[PDB]
């Protein structure tokens, strides 16, 4: 991707995280576990449904359209009718295919951007009381219990208290 997070420095997905698109996996003395991030997933869902609804709305319903008849001395008008029908069909086929092809790439870049933003948000919080390992992973220097974990996954991690 353009942002280098999905299939980048984080090289795989989690099949054990079932309730969201992006999230955390933690590990301390109490135990382990996954947990989704709700704000990022909610924003992404809003954006994606908006995009799908706009795509649906820009194409209007097609009403009754049946062919005509001509005799042996009206070949020019028959050819003009065929020309018009074929041209409009070709134009709309091109439009639909191009729209889908171009929207798919932007949709795939959106999720990469969201994952990168989440990683940076956590990294600026921990700054000094944690070591960056490389796979999207942080190893604490002090002892981080469940209150510490839940404060990290909230944005209100208190840097001075843990030096």
């Amino acid at each position, epitope marked *: 991707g353009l942002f280098g997070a999905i299939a980048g420095f984080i090289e795989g997905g989690w099949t054990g995280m*079932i*309730d969201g698109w992006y999230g955390y996996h933690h590990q301390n003395e109490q135990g382990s576990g996954y947990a989704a991030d*709700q704000k990022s*997933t*909610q924003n992404a*869902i*809003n954006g*994606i*449904t908006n995009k*799908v*609804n706009s795509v*649906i*709305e820009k194409m209007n319903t097609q009403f009754t359209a049946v062919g005509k008849e001509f005799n042996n001395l009206e070949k020019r008008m028959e050819n003009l009718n065929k020309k018009v029908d074929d041209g409009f069909l070709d134009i709309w086929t091109y439009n639909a295919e191009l729209l889908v092809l171009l929207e798919n790439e932007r949709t795939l870049d959106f999720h990469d951007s969201n994952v990168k933003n989440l990683y940076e948000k956590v990294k600026i919080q921990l700054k000094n009381n944690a070591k960056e390992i490389g796979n999207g992973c942080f190893e604490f220097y002090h002892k981080c219990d469940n209150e510490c974990m839940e404060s990290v996954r909230n944005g209100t991690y208190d840097y001075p208290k843990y030096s």
Partner: nanobody
Amino acid sequence: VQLVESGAEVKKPGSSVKVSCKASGGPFRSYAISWVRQAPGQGPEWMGGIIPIFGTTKYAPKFQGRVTITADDFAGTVYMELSSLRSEDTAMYYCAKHMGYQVRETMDVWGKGTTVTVS
């Protein structure tokens, strides 16, 4: 948004029933949808709900083997099917919004109601 259920139905025991729910706005939604039951003279009862994109469905432990909830997405409709009707599945059925994409305890928009009688 506005939620509109289907019409009122009367059946006899041993059969099944299928109610529907239609929401205004764009066909695709970013909130979960739940179904609530209320018998005459008692408090409401949560039956089950559905999630917008992941497609997960949740049911109450009482209504485990009978209820089936489905969606249409492109139409904007949600369907609920209840099987093996007893004489106790005679109540008012409501369709409820949820706010977010998860089936939490906060339903902020309700429909109007639909009576299903069994006899």
